[PDB]
Amino acid sequence: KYVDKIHIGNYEIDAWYFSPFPEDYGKQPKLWLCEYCLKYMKYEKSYRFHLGQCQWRQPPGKEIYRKSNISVHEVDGKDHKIYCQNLCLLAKLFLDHRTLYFDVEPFVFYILTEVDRQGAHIVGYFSKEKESPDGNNVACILTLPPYQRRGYGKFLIAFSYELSKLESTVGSPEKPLSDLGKLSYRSYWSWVLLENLRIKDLSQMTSITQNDIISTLQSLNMVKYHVICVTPKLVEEHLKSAQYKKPPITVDSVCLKWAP
Ligand SMILES: CC(C)(COP(=O)(O)OP(=O)(O)OC[C@H]1O[C@@H](n2cnc3c(N)ncnc32)[C@H](O)[C@@H]1OP(=O)(O)O)[C@@H](O)C(=O)NCCC(=O)NCCS
Ligand SMILES: [Zn+2]
Prior knowledge:
By secondary structure, this protein is an alpha+beta fold. The chain is built from eight helices and 13 strands. The protein has helices at 23-26, 44-53, 81-92, 152-166, 179-196, 200-206, 210-219, 232-240, and strands at residues 5-8, 11-14, 31-33, 40-41, 62-67, 70-76, 107-116, 119-129, 136-138, 141-143, 172-173, 223-224, 227-228. Strand 12 (223-224) and strand 13 (227-228) form a beta hairpin. It is elongated.
């Protein structure tokens, strides 16, 4: 039996994919995860014992962003191996990506949490390969199912580009993108590009690669072969529309503490 249901915090969540937890963990009806240190446990009794004893109330690593009730922690795989391995096992339940089976040490993990008086509760994350030879600025991105459809995905995508900008570099998500990844990236890219029009220049200003700018402007019919072709009025009409709305949660540069 594979792991098919997890309990984490106040949520139970069904699996979407196989994840390589040790076999005896799959055998039980539920896998129980500490929401703060991501330890995985086999029994409600071991879970309850852990909850009473664990001192963690947020992710490890460095808190690098806080705005309203959300915060981001930067977690280097080399520095917090066990945590990042636990994270990857969790994530693999909802992602089919090869990096989830690989060493965590070559990666950095950006953990998104909602903060309240009880703690900083994980809602999603993205991973990033240090010094990616393919210029990938995200490897994996995930919003845990109970938190989906609230704008956290597009926040994580935006955050990944805010780092690329500060690194003075373009980047793209590791391909192939899942269908849900495609929808999310296209939405973000569309908004950013239209605000900027209200290609190498756009690429330099946004850290979005020219290829991803070209494919996005193609969908907006704002490019000829590549040359951008749109009026200010056309751009304003799109930004007025319900199809190219601003992300509900955006990254504020004056709430970030980060250098390359
Ligand atoms: C991709 C993912 C991170 C999006 O997270 P999220 O928090 O739901 O994203 P958002 O709330 O910011 O939504 C982004 C866009 O995706 C659309 N979307 C998200 N889930 C959708 C769904 N199930 N059906 C249709 N549209 C969906 C949203 O409506 C939104 O469109 P809009 O910007 O035009 O309004 C999330 O679906 C996920 O974690 N999936 C599993 C892992 C995965 O596939 N990751 C990406 C792999 S490359
Ligand atoms: Zn714990």
